[PDB]
Design a protein around this nucleic acid. Structure first.
Lengths: 121, 467, 54, 67, 23
RNA sequence: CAUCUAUAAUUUUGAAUAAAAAUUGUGCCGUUGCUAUGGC
């Protein structure tokens, strides 16, 4: 059992990266590990996507602790290059945060992946 | 003195050449050559040189250039017409000078001569943009700055040999002369997110189709310098484009994972989706390893009037016909899986067993994305390329239901950006030059910087055919 | 100022479909997502050019 | 900028009427209401025919315009 | 990290000193 | 684009400089031979 806790399979990972692009399009996703920690402190992060191929796993392993503190679930992607590509940016992001907004038309999708993610945890 | 007499005279010279070439191959077939001209004018896959190639002796030559982050390259090959008989090239001093036009993220377009297949591509001329083409208004429809000012991305030479169009992240389409590289016109996209992604001239015509980043595609008239049409329907960015001699235009969008076959004759479109299921693939394998779900489809080459190939990001290469909604032949990991990262870098802890535990075995392996993918027109062969430095050429079967790997070429190093094929020689013997603009970064975003020995330049592979 | 798909609609009660709500975009004739600015902007630019040339 | 593209659909020859019937679709972006004389001109050129033998009628610009 | 890697510490200080030289 | 001309090739005269007809792979450094290859 490595420190790399929940890491999804191929199809699940695909679909969260697709909600990643749609939330980045609707400005519902924030970028960076330090910014993810910031919105964790803010209490507006609704869930967290993180990487697995970073330098090293620890600088983003600091986030699951605050996740279990502020009951905000999280999961891992295998490729941070893929995570930055679904973020839609030239540089590989390693940690991104889905926020909260009540007037969002994709909220059923986010609550759907919330069900699937909680059954994964 | 009469044009019909002159046409007949050119036909007489044509048939004289045909019969002398027939005598040469001898040391029926003439009408077969005529039917070959008609198939060139319109036909299905007829160029069947998928077995005459000699890939093991294919001479490789990498060419490092000073400019950094090459984005695209466009080869102009002048061909002799069938209806008229002068040329497809415009000038007399050209006489079929094989041209190359490379655009690089240093805002530089460069024309090369590639007229010889043994020598190196010669840097004929160039034109570089800069920040003096930064526009003054920054908030209007007017983007008529004569040079580019931000992140050129794609290029396309017109088939008449008169003009070359360029588009990039400065939401402009500047068309230039091919000799002086003078901006003969510039078309603004009149958009905030209308950035140029990929261009497509209709074969043997000026009808240029521009896949654009605002989820729309613009088709242009080049001789009159205007925008004919815009077509909408992409749920994601209109990432890549491909076109042929007729009024069909295939465009791939990445994150909806969709292949749109746009039909200009109706103004309408047709759809294509994949949908390989890993649980079904694994249960089928149990009826018989890894199964990578499709993240993004990124590249298309329309190989025929009825068939096209699509390279995706998770290693899949899908061949498609117009009859079925499904891919008629999907293909698993093409350039292999990416090599696994290192334990010390993934963990940063002196415990080596915990390091390999963080390496996790199989759960961190990813495949190579098929970065570029080019098909020889109306032929039975096609080429794909990734940042593996392994350019992989395959051939499709005669029944058009499968493709098999012809071979690999290792002269290129890094992210191959754009591939083009130039055929030359007589009718019997054909020499093929496979040129590939290749950089260290992807054209859209960086996403990677450490590829060992990746160089900015062009790789040339010259092969012959014999059989 | 916003067309659905390709069709311009000035009715706020359209009850769109899913493809169409993906296909919401500004009008290409609109001064916002398209053509030249409106009469107010052009008349103010006209009076401003007139005053600066005066 | 503006390019009047004159397109056809549903083209049927009526040799009984010794003619060709077709639905005309005009795209005139950055433009409004091109005249039927010019349409007949361009159509006669496109079909290698004569404008007097060409006839166009019943035209309707869409909501908004441009087509 | 239970047993931290002074190689990473040193390369981090190396990037810091590269920025200091970039000043 | 054609012509014209500049640069680069033959011809003739002069041992030769000379005279004219007339004609028609790098942004930066590096390994490295007679081009290939590192890293920024």
């Amino acid at each position: 059992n490595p420190k790399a806790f929940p890491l999804a399979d191929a199809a699940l990972t695909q679909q969260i990266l697709d909600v990643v692009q749609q939330a980045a399009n609707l400005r519902q996703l924030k970028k960076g590990a330090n910014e993810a920690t910031k919105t964790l402190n803010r209490g507006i992060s609704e869930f967290i996507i993180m990487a697995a191929d970073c330098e090293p796993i620890e600088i983003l392993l600091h986030l699951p602790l605050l996740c279990e503190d502020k009951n905000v679930p999280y999961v891992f992607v295998p490729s941070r290059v893929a995570l930055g590509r679904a973020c839609g940016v030239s540089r590989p992001v390693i940690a991104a945060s889905i926020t909260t907004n009540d007037a969002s038309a994709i909220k059923t999708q986010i609550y759907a992946v919330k069900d699937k993610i909680e059954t994964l945890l | 003195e009469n044009p019909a007499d002159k046409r007949r005279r050119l036909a007489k010279q044509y048939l004289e050449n045909l019969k002398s070439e027939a005598n040469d191959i001898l040391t029926d077939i003439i009408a077969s050559r005529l039917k070959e001209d008609v198939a060139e004018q319109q036909g299905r896959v007829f160029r069947y040189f998928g077995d005459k190639l000699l890939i093991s002796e294919a001479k490789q030559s990498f060419t490092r250039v000073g400019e950094n982050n090459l984005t695209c390259i466009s080869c102009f090959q002048p061909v002799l017409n069938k209806y008229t008989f002068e040329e497809s090239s415009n000038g007399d001093k050209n006489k079929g000078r094989l041209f190359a036009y490379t655009v690089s993220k240093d805002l530089q377009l460069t024309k090369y001569d590639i007229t010889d297949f043994s020598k190196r591509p010669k840097k004929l001329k160039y034109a570089k943009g800069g920040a003096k083409y930064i526009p003054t208004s920054k908030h209007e429809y007017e983007n008529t700055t004569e040079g580019h000012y931000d992140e050129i991305l794609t290029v396309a030479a017109s088939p008449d040999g008169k003009y070359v169009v360029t588009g990039g992240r400065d939401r402009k389409l500047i068309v230039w002369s091919t000799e002086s590289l003078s901006p003969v016109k510039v078309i603004p996209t009149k958009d905030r997110r209308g950035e140029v992604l990929s261009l497509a001239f209709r074969k043997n015509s000026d009808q240029l189709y521009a896949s654009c980043a605002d989820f729309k595609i613009r088709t242009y008239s080049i001789n009159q310098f205007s925008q004919l049409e815009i077509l909408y329907g992409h749920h994601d960015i209109v990432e890549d484009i491909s076109a042929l001699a007729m009024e069909r235009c295939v465009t791939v969008g990445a994150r909806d994972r969709t292949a749109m076959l746009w039909k200009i004759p109706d103004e309408t479109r047709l759809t294509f989706r994949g949908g390989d299921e890993p649980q079904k693939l694994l249960r089928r394998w149990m009826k018989e390893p890894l199964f990578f779900c499709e993240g993004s489809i990124d590249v298309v080459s329309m190989v025929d009037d009825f068939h096209f190939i699509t390279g995706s990001d998770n290693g899949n290469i899908c061949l498609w016909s117009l009859a079925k909604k499904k891919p008629i032949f999907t293909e698993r990991i093409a350039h292999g899986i990416l090599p696994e990262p290192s334990f010390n870098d993934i963990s940063g802890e002196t415990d080596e067993e915990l390091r390999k535990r963080q390496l996790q075995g199989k759960k961190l392996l990813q495949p190579f994305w098929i970065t570029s993918l080019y098909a020889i027109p109306y032929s039975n062969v096609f080429i794909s390329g990734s940042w593996s430095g392994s350019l992989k050429v395959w051939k499709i079967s005669d029944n058009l239901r499968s493709f098999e790997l012809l071979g690999e070429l290792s002269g290129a190093k890094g992210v191959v950006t754009k591939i083009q094929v130039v055929e030359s020689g007589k009718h019997g013997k054909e020499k093929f030059r496979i040129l590939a603009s290749i950089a260290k970064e992807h054209r859209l975003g960086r996403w990677i910087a450490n590829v060992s020995g990746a160089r900015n330049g062009i790789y040339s592979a010259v092969i012959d055919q014999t059989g | 100022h916003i067309a659905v798909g390709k069709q311009i609609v000035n009715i706020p009660s359209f009850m769109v479909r899913l493809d169409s709500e993906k296909h919401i975009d500004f009008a290409p004739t609109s001064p916002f997502g398209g053509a030249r600015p409106g009469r107010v902007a052009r008349r103010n630019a006209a009076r401003k050019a007139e005053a600066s040339g005066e | 900028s503006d390019a009047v593209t004159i397109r056809t659909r549903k083209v049927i020859s009526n040799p009984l009427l010794a003619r060709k019937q077709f639905v005309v679709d005009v795209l005139h972006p950055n433009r409004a209401n091109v005249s039927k004389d010019e349409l007949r001109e361009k159509l006669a050129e496109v079909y290698k025919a004569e404008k007097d033998a060409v006839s166009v009628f019943g035209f309707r610009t869409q909501f908004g315009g441009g087509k | 990290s239970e047993e931290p890697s002074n190689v990473f510490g040193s390369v981090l200080k190396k990037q810091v000193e590269q920025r200091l030289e970039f000043y």
